[PDB]
Design a protein around this ligand. Structure first.
Ligand SMILES: Nc1ncnc2c1ncn2[C@@H]1O[C@H](COP(=O)(O)OP(=O)(O)OP(=O)(O)O)[C@@H](O)[C@H]1O
Lengths: 94, 70, 194, 39, 52, 139, 286, 51, 152, 154
């Protein structure tokens, strides 16, 4: 659910969404890393975890709209940056 | 001709010992039986300076060979 | 390069131009104390029997050298005025007696100051050399001169330090030499071909 | 660098003759190749 | 004596210890090239400035 | 166009390349060699050879008919290649030679000590020996 | 199992000349042939080939024929002239994956274990390499059919040979952007490279056409990788990643500044080498 | 075999070379194993002591 | 037993020895277990070498997954002194088999924290190469998925 | 290649020169002296040839021989690029000291002697501008290729 912006949750949030105490969530997430459904790191002193890779799930025809749109303006970045390459690199080779 | 060839053998090595410049570490070790049948022009300095005879041990280094072999 | 040409002090002889060999010893120690750091000083000039016994005849220079080595900071300025004043009167050091001790100051400052970080400013008067405002105006012209890598606090009365990685200071001399040689080749290029 | 390129191509001058080989030695080389073809 | 490096505190005696090998090989070994080349351009006076 | 002709000249190389040896050159880009056939020749070059890769004793390359310089060679010797170092030591130890304290240390002084500690002989400047002759009764 | 393939220009032209020699049929005929060669060190090799007689009718297109007598005799000739040369698979002319190319490979699997196919191009236009090879994998999986088999494309490239480069470079004579300096990579992979990313960008846009309108199977095995693309989308500009980027860039223009500083002095030495050719020549000759 | 010479005639030069090839080939830098040499003479007086 | 040292975090030592320090007398297997019990000095080396492996099996995966942990939390997961915890974390990093940078003013220790001048953009380039291989993976898989439904 | 064909040796006995040139098309390539040793003419003749190619073949071999894939969109061993960037500069210093050597014997013996005389030992001039090209092309490519991916990738 968390985007590629942060995806860094906290043990208080695990204690909120899973109603399980502070001294068990680390034993939970070490098991999640041992299974390998998730891949990230664990800070203990700031009570946050840097989740990086998650197990990929399935999705309906609504998520391909968002993946469609995030593909869409990623096209014109390649168009725009390559446009400088053919324009400024014009006379370098015919 | 068999002697002229050997003459040309000695001329080449006599040149190539002078083709050095003290910078390369190429050391020539030469071992013979009789020093009598040799040219002293081979034994000039710049080519040959160190001469090592192997004299016979008498008692002292002699017993060490007995220790090592026995 | 002067101390490096003065590296041996063994094959150097009872000369004609320094008829005292000990005068040559004083010259090579006066240039070496700037020229080399502690490792070289804690191996080279401290373990030489040929260098120790000739300044064994010297009361002043033995004390003037060892006071920096034994961290005898306050007495170092005393013989510093002596050796600097003699250097002012001396031939061939008279071009640079003014440049010598201002290197000796910033060397003796940086040696002590790169030990601590939280060392205050009113510590150096009684342990290092008297005059708090003298230390003030003397360090202000050195941090302000662009060396003596630290940052002094004033009204909480403490001297802070920092550490620069060799990424800016090693770069500064590169832009200096680049501007120098660019001035050189541009000047020559204006000279030749009219 | 470019000024050391552009203030540089005036001493190209008096490049009078790049003779290929010769005329007499070329005819003599053709005669020697003719002798090689006859032999 | 620079055999070990760090810092020393006087209020309580905390030794902040840190190390990284800095970039040394890159800048100076390209820097002495400059003072070679300045000697080359000074040698260009011995064939250019005196001559033409 | 000059890059096209730049590769074209090496057709003379091929396989049958004359195996001579460089001796000297009269001038720029024309030299004198001595073939492995026994005779000497006044030969031409090929231009792409770096001329600063010349003149030790490295064997040059010659065309078998037109007989000019083709290509420089890495060195070669058939004699005893290089003492192949694996099954080539005669596994005699220093301890196997008893009673040669003078000469064993003395040849170490002359042969492998300037080999390793070259700058001591350079710094004191005592002219380390070029070659060494050793002799005596057999056995 | 199979790393990659090696394709020569001799067989590459030696399919297209067959497309010329059966191009007189006009209507429709596909160049299907037997692919010969080796594979060593798990690197696939393609050296020689021929083409088998083949016809195909549009009604009931599940019928193929290869003259196996022609397959035996000419390949026995090829073994006799070249015992090193052997079978490596087959090929078809491959415009758009014709349907008999699921059981041609099963027809002649009894000769080569990895009886690999090669799709070629007869109308050459793209921004890449129109050379293709699949590999046969079969699957008894949970979904799909119980008997399920789908080809999988192993990567494809044009291997060279020191013999054939003389003839290839001889037959070009047209344009060749060699003298690889500061500009060859700029066009072979920087002008052309981002446009190489253009087509792979546009291919998932071509899969994207099934939002509510395209084909009936939806995702299953397409979207874990697509999720992994946006998941593995690289790091944003906040870290010392910025400062290390500035650091190493700022280190690189030291070297560029150095060599740039040397070059003008080099051409200045070349200038004095020309003024010496000016002033001590004009008085001498006149 | 010979003893040696002080190099009188021109013939015994290369014969001394032929003999000194033999002496080095006997026990010079080689594991002389399984190759047994049996010799014979009428006078062992004209022989090299190195032989 | 081998499952415990193949798998993830171990239940300290007291939560283990109450479950397995008793079957070493039971069953029909008690004799090399009595080579663990009966000798009390070799056996003591087995209680303390067993204690070494169970106190170490924490430390490996702690170094793996724990970016920065407090000293008291780890010493609580070792059920012993903070000083004995420092003796455990000294002789392993002078062994340098587990790298850590511990604290003794705030107790803020951490694992695998170098300066990294290079691995930021270096591992970033690794992410680039894996990204371009990943987008190369789907591309040749799409067109055959179209060919199995819209061929003829 | 030079495709040949027999000529009649009967006409050689006749002393009659064959083949009756009506076009300046055959006497364009000159025959070799080695085939002139043989019977190329006395018994055979040369033929001028060319080759038949078309755009159907030119594009499909031009666009396919030396083509990269995503190679220039990489970083080229990001720890070792700068390491190599010292691994050239370090001996480039001493080669610049040879450039601080060889200029100093100018205004001396004429440079044609400085052409023959330098065939045993290396020059700083050519070897110098070699590594300027090497260090330049090794750096600017990885520099620009490093900076496109910041724009393209997020
Ligand atoms: N420590 C020793 N000192 C002298 N001789 C020894 C020693 N140990 C063994 N020997 C014997 O002396 C012989 C030395 O062999 P080597 O071939 O070196 O003799 P040499 O001096 O070269 O005489 P030649 O030139 O006739 O071979 C060996 O055969 C060995 O049996």
């Amino acid at each position: 659910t968390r985007p590629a912006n942060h995806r860094q949750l906290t043990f208080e949030e695990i204690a909120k969404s899973a109603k399980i105490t502070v001294n068990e969530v680390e034993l939970l997430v070490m098991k999640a890393l041992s299974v390998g459904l998730v891949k990230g790191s664990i800070d203990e002193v700031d009570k946050r975890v840097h989740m990086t890779w998650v197990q990929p799930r399935v999705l309906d025809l609504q998520q391909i709209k968002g993946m469609k749109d995030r593909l869409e303006f990623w096209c014109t970045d390649v168009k725009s940056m390559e446009m400088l390459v053919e324009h400024q690199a014009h006379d370098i080779l015919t | 001709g068999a002697d002229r060839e050997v003459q040309r053998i000695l001329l080449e090595l006599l040149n190539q010992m002078d083709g050095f410049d003290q910078n390369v570490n190429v050391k020539v070790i030469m071992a013979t039986n009789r020093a009598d049948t040799l040219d002293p022009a081979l034994l000039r300095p710049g080519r040959l300076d160190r001469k090592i005879e192997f004299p016979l041990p008498d008692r002292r280094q002699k017993r060490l060979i007995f220790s090592t072999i026995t | 390069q002067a101390a490096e040409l003065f590296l041996d002090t063994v094959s150097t002889f009872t000369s004609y131009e320094l008829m005292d060999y000990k005068t040559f010893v004083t010259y090579t120690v006066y240039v070496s104390m700037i020229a080399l750091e502690r490792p070289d000083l804690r191996e080279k000039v401290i373990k030489g029997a040929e260098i120790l016994e000739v300044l064994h005849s010297l009361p002043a220079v033995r004390q003037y050298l060892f006071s920096l080595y034994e961290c005898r900071y306050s007495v170092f300025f005393q013989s510093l005025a002596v050796v600097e004043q003699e250097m002012k009167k001396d031939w061939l050091f008279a071009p640079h007696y003014r440049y010598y001790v201002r290197e000796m100051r910033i060397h003796a400052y940086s040696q002590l100051l790169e030990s601590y970080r939280s060392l205050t400013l009113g510590y150096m008067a009684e342990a290092f050399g008297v005059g708090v405002e003298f230390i003030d105006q003397e360090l202000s012209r050195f941090i302000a001169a662009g060396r003596l890598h630290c940052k002094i606090d004033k009204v909480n009365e403490i001297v802070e330090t920092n550490r620069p990685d060799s990424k800016n200071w090693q770069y500064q001399e590169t832009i200096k030499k680049g501007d120098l040689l660019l001035n050189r080749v541009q000047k020559l290029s204006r000279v030749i071909n009219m | 660098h470019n000024m050391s390129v552009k203030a540089m191509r005036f001493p190209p001058k008096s490049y009078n003759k790049d003779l290929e080989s010769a005329e007499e030695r070329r005819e003599r080389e053709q005669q020697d190749l003719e002798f090689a073809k006859e032999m | 004596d620079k055999k070990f490096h760090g810092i020393l505190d006087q209020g309580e005696g905390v030794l902040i210890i840190f190390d990284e090998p800095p970039v040394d090989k890159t800048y100076e070994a390209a820097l002495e090239t400059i003072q070679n080349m300045s000697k080359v351009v000074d040698s260009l006076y011995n064939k250019a400035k005196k001559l033409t | 166009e000059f890059l096209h002709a730049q590769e074209e000249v090496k057709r003379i190389q091929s396989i049958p390349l004359v195996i001579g040896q460089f001796l000297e050159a009269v001038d720029q880009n024309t030299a004198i060699v001595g073939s492995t056939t026994g005779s000497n020749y006044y030969v031409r070059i090929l231009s792409t050879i770096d001329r600063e890769l010349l003149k030790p004793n490295a064997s040059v390359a010659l065309h078998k008919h037109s007989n000019a310089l083709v290509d420089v060679l890495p060195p070669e010797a058939d004699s005893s290649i290089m003492m192949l170092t694996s099954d080539q030591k005669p596994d005699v130890m220093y301890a196997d030679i008893g009673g040669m304290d003078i000469q064993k240390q003395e040849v170490r002084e002359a042969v492998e000590l300037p080999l390793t500690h070259f700058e001591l002989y350079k710094q004191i400047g005592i002219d380390p020996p070029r070659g060494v002759l050793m002799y005596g009764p057999p056995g | 199992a199979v790393q990659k393939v090696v394709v020569h220009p001799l067989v590459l032209l030696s399919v297209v000349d067959h497309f010329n020699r059966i191009g007189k049929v006009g209507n429709q005929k596909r160049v299907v042939g037997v692919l010969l060669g080796s594979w060593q060190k798990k690197v696939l090799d393609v050296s020689n080939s021929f083409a088998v007689p083949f016809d195909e009718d549009d009604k009931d297109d599940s019928v193929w024929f290869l003259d196996h007598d022609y397959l035996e005799n000419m390949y026995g000739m090829f073994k006799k002239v070249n015992a090193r040369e052997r079978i490596v698979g087959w090929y078809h002319t491959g415009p758009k994956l014709h349907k008999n190319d699921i059981a041609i490979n099963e027809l002649m699997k009894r000769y080569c274990p990895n009886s690999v196919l090669v799709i070629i191009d007869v109308k050459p236009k793209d921004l890449g390499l129109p050379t293709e090879a699949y590999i046969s994998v079969e699957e008894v999986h949970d979904d799909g059919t119980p008997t399920s088999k789908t080809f999988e494309h192993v990567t494809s490239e044009i291997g060279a040979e020191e013999a054939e480069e003389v003839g290839v470079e001889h037959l070009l004579r047209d344009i060749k952007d060699t003298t690889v300096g500061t500009l060859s990579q700029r066009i072979t992979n920087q002008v052309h490279g981002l446009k190489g990313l253009n087509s792979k960008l546009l291919d998932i846009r071509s899969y994207l056409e099934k939002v509510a309108t395209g084909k009936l199977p939806i995702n299953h095995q397409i979207i874990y990788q697509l999720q992994d693309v946006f998941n593995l989308l690289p790091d944003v500009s906040l870290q010392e990643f910025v400062k290390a980027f500035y650091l190493k860039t700022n280190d690189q223009m030291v070297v560029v500044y150095l060599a740039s500083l040397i070059r003008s002095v080099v051409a200045l030495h070349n200038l004095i080498n020309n003024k010496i050719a000016n002033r001590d020549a004009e008085k001498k000759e006149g | 075999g010979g003893r040696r010479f002080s190099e009188g005639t021109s013939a015994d030069r290369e014969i001394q070379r032929t003999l000194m090839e033999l002496l080095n080939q006997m026990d010079g830098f080689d594991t002389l194993h399984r190759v047994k040499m049996i010799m014979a003479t009428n006078r062992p007086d004209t022989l090299d002591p190195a032989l | 037993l081998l499952k415990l040292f193949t798998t993830m975090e171990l239940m300290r030592w007291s939560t283990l020895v109450e479950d397995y320090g008793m079957e070493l007398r039971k069953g029909s297997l008690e004799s090399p277990a009595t080579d663990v019990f009966g000798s009390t000095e070799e056996g003591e080396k087995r209680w303390k070498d067993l204690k070494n492996r169970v106190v170490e099996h924490n430390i490996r995966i702690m170094a793996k997954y724990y970016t920065r942990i407090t000293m008291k939390r780890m010493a609580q997961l070792l059920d012993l002194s903070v000083d004995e915890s420092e003796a455990f974390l000294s002789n392993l990093v002078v062994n340098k088999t587990i790298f850590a940078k511990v604290d003794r003013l705030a107790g803020i220790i951490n694992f695998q924290r170098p300066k990294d001048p290079n691995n930021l953009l270096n591992d970033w380039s690794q992410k680039l190469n894996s990204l371009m291989s990943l987008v190369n993976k789907t591309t040749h898989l799409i067109a055959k998925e179209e060919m199995i439904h819209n061929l003829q | 290649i030079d495709a040949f064909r027999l000529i009649n040796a009967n006409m050689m006995v006749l002393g009659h020169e064959p083949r009756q040139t009506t076009s300046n098309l055959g006497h364009l390539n000159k025959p070799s002296i080695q085939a002139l040793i043989h019977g190329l003419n006395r018994h055979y003749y040369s033929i001028t040839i060319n080759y038949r190619k078309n755009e159907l073949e030119q594009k499909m071999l031009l666009n396919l021989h030396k083509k990269s894939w995503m190679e220039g969109l990489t970083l080229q061993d990001y720890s070792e690029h700068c390491k190599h960037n010292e691994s050239v500069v370090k001996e480039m210093l001493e080669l610049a000291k040879n450039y601080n050597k060889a200029v100093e014997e100018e205004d001396k013996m004429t440079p044609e002697q400085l052409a023959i005389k330098n065939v045993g030992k290396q020059d700083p001039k050519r070897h110098l501008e070699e590594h300027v090209d090497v260090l330049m092309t090794s750096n600017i490519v990885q520099c620009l290729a490093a900076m496109l991916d910041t724009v393209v990738f997020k």
